[PDB]
Design a protein around this ligand. Sequence first.
Ligand SMILES: [Zn+2]
Ligand SMILES: [Zn+2]
Ligand SMILES: [Zn+2]
Ligand SMILES: [Zn+2]
Lengths: 366, 263, 304, 408
Amino acid sequence: XXXXXXXXXXXXXXXXXXXXXXXXXXXXXXXXXXXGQVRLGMMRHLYVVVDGSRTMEDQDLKPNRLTCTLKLLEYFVEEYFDQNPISQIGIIVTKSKRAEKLTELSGNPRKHITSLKKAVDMTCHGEPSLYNSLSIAMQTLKHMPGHTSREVLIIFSSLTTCDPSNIYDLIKTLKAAKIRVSVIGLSAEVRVCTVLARETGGTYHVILDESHYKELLTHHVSPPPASSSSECSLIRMGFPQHTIXXXXXXXXXXXXXXXXXXXXXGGYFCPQCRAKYCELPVECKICGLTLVSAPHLARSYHHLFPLDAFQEIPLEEYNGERFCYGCQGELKDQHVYVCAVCQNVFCVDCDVFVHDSLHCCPGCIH
Amino acid sequence: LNLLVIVVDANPIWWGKQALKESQFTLSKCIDAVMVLGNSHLFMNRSNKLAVIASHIQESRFLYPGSKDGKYELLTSANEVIVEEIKDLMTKSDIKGQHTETLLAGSLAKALCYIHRMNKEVKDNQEMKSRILVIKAAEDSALQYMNFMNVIFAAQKQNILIDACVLDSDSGLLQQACDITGGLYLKVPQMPSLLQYLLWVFLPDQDQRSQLILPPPVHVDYRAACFCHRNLIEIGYVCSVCLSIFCNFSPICTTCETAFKIS
Amino acid sequence: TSGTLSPLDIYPKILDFHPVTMATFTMTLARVCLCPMIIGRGNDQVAISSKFETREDIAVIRNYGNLLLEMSAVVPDGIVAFFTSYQYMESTVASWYEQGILENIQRNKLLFIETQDGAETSVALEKYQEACENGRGAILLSVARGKVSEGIDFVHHYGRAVIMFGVPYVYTQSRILKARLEYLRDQFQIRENDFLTFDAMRHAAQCVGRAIRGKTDYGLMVFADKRFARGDKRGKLPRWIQEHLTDANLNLTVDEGVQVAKYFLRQMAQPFHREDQLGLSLLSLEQLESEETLKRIEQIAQQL
Amino acid sequence: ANKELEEKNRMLQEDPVLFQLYKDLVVSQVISAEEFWANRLXXXXXXXXXXXXXXXXXXXXXXXXXXXXXXXXXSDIIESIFRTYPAVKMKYAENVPHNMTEKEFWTRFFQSHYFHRXXXXXXXXXXXXXXXXXXXXXXXXXXXXXXXXXXXXXXXXXXXXXXXXXXXXXXXXXXXXXXXXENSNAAIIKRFNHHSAMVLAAGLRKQPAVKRAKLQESIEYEDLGXXXXXXXIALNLKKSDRYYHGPTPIXXXXXXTSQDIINSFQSIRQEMEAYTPKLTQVLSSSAASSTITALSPGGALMQXXXXXXXXXXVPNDIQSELKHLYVAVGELLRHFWSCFXXXXXXXXXXXXXXXXXXXXXXXXXXXXXXXXXXXXXXXXXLVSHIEEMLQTAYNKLHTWXXXXXXXX
Ligand SMILES: [Zn+2]
Ligand SMILES: [Zn+2]
Ligand SMILES: [Zn+2]
Ligand SMILES: [Zn+2]
């Protein structure tokens, strides 16, 4: 009731500035990113199980937990389809001791984000059911092929995990069915989700803030490394070229579509069944082939020959290269970042840009 | 507020063969058409910005960054620094043999992070749209494809358009980039008219692409080959560890030495 | 040797006893590992106590049930709730039914009430341990005197929040108490109000301090009535619990205690891996041979 | 049992497009109804793949009222009581007409042991309460604590237990002093113990080993032993140059002899010395006029492209025809290419392939009949894409036949 005494003063002219700068510096933090030269699960049928519990309506977040969770899942679907194109998502809301396959396992963000914009309007009545949700996710994820790192992400809030049967035989089955389940938890640590996470192979985490929860979902965007158990197969792939209406439709093949459609003149075929698809990449609806344009293999090549660390040094320190090798600007701050191989000079803006978006050192290309 | 970033493929070997060809069109009219496009872009509006990069064979040195002869003054200073920078670049030069094909990935990387820092410079009232012209005249090396796609996807995320005027030869990676980012591709059919191509197709900004009727998009080939025999594929075998394209089915995956599980 | 013995000044003063070493070892931690709170303030600002001597006061039992409800809604995986006497647990769980509370506690977690059968207690314990592992929430409420809290120990996730209801005073027993107290006045020199407080605190801190097994275990351990803040009764809890009893935590409300529990569990459910202990709360082979570590271990242990 | 019939029907009803398909295939004399409904397994597991277990307050979720003696119609409550109290299950087996109704029966259900938590001689639930007491005494006497291996054995957690003779606290369990309200409070304790035990057992369907197991579990510390990190299989790529120049085919890249390097360096070092003509050298106006001639819509670089001449003549009903056709041929090629891919070298899968061959040939006959009945209206709208798909099915069938006859 006396927080007003948190503001001290020594000279009081820049001392209130020092207290405000200490507070504003203590109101921020940096992320923790991990590097690996290890095998990753790059075809990735992930399957999101959201709570629809009573505890979703609690107001620990700035809106209630349903709204914030659903907003960050909209961001999650966006960044996951932005970074892994082959993969798919399916969304289950778990509600009233039963599980509901809200959006089936598909690979385009339009249907999922449309369903989340719908699912803002829900009710969140009852206690969850981890049994039935893992059962529906298992039931769909039995028969995906063995090289797929089949992954479930349970955004789980409440504590009473109201199952209708025994949920250690599910964990033994899902251990044998080489699935991988990771739970992001709200407000607590629950022993059953801990056993599920450490036994199926996943990772369990509990949420402080908006920013920490964004860091956790960003941690689950990237393809997680594989165990010594998952099959390393060789999936047969198809690379259909784009085909416009051939020569002003001189002996074309006028089709409707293949999944309220208009008359398609041309587009993408299939090299297996010779059907008609508008969008690529799409799993072949009548063959079982997977269809790839092949920058969609190049969109996720940075995981395989990855980045390295920047040697971060704040001080002045021998810098005979005053200008940024990134964008030709002066280093007006005390943070200078130097690469490993070429050992050029980069600033903070070039650091965040290279390590988040461009994914390569501009020096090592030269 | 707009930001044109011209990139001129200054291959000294290619323009050297062009200047020993004794044609009409040499490097002088290329860099002069570059500067007239730059002064035209600064001339169209006060708030416009300009940056001109020159990919050499071994370095991405930027070119950019009173009135004696009647120009506007900042156009005169920009032309003086571009002229003196290409004279410092091309004359004082080197010779090596293992790396003689030009590069385009690094200059595009510098352009991407330059547009990033110049978008951090922008205040809250105004907003910056941006594009990268690429004036290519040489043959691109295949060896940096792993790098090259990456900068395209950066321009996919950073919403930077990419345009390309190729001079002599077609380039699959660069028409690929201009297909992905939403930019524009153009293969010039006659050299010395270069400036008049630029001042109608590549001078107009994003809110004039939609107004002008422009030359139509060429169909883009999504050819794909194996890493085995380099030949064209319509159905391939792709690993899930190495993520590499194989043409014919093989037991032991060569790209990552995978102990392949056989069924 | 015990995990709780406090104060150590009184075991030579009862047992005709003169030892070499009277030692207390301070809980050195790299992570808070426990928080005791003294919830001695109702949500209506009613003074929580047990002054009535087992003859029920209604609003205090109401605030006990409100504490158990909201602490059920916060804490995971099993809450242990020690009452004063089996007549008092009998009466409390009686008036948690006619008053509309106990169905809500059912909605959050699964109760397992105690009885003084030798076999029914074991079945209730077995179902309580099969409900802390099969998903749901389980809450064992017992008496702080009997065999439930003497041997049967509650480890990493069986009791997260040991709720000590009341101050356990031996109130039912006869003139054996008055006569042992007259003896300790006369032929030993230990006061009336000193020995009663000592006995009550050894039972309360005996039943509380079972929840924690190692450094990687965390136990909320609440004390629910105002008397645990009164200096002599707080002064006879052991040193490794008074060290983590903050003056802000001293005499919390119900809801302030619930928010401290939430912040406790959220700050203490994160990856606290072995690499966070090799500095402070763990020692390797070669971290022993340094004489700076020897100075540290000289500073930790104390005597009385 | 006529299950399948009722399923395929229920679907056809709910799914009229599928009904259409079912007609266009079965009724069209291409395949038989049994095959179609046979290999079309796509449905849910159960009503919810399980039910809703009795969480708690199965008597106090919408307590005694589907709006005491109010209405009783909530499905979760009646199913949770059916699971939870099997004495009420057997009572529902007995007294269900046979002379009472759910109004009177559930009015006699909100009596004691079940809603009030009492213990007394009462109405028709009295013998059910006696059987529940016998189940509790069977759990206490005929059964015991299963994990009494190294803990939780409350009867024998004392090595020397005696009678009330030579002790201090011998007035622990008193054979006297049995009151009314006190026995009621003990009854409330017993009913909640039994209620939570039935919840936990209903959600759980049907030696030195266990003792050393519980001992070694309760002794150990997670700190003072081994770590918790699984593995990470190291992916050290062998030939990363295959990644560097990717799936782009090898362009014609023949830079000539390194004499040209020296010649070009000489010529361009001489070239970029003398520089900056701006008025004179840049554009001749005739080149600009020819460029405007080219970029005008009848010249070079204006490819006569973005034409896209379409055939929108009879849109809507032909679109409906093509919706029926692409649904039908999608189901046909679904079955064909789903069974086709791996040869599955036995006689059952080859027989399914022969049935697929028969369905394929009759599908081609039905497609030719549909093309004749459709495209003979106004002479437009090439349907030959569906004929391309069915011709590729025809081709894979004959190519598999020649391949397996080579593999004979
Ligand atoms: Zn296909
Ligand atoms: Zn580098
Ligand atoms: Zn920079
Ligand atoms: Zn591989």
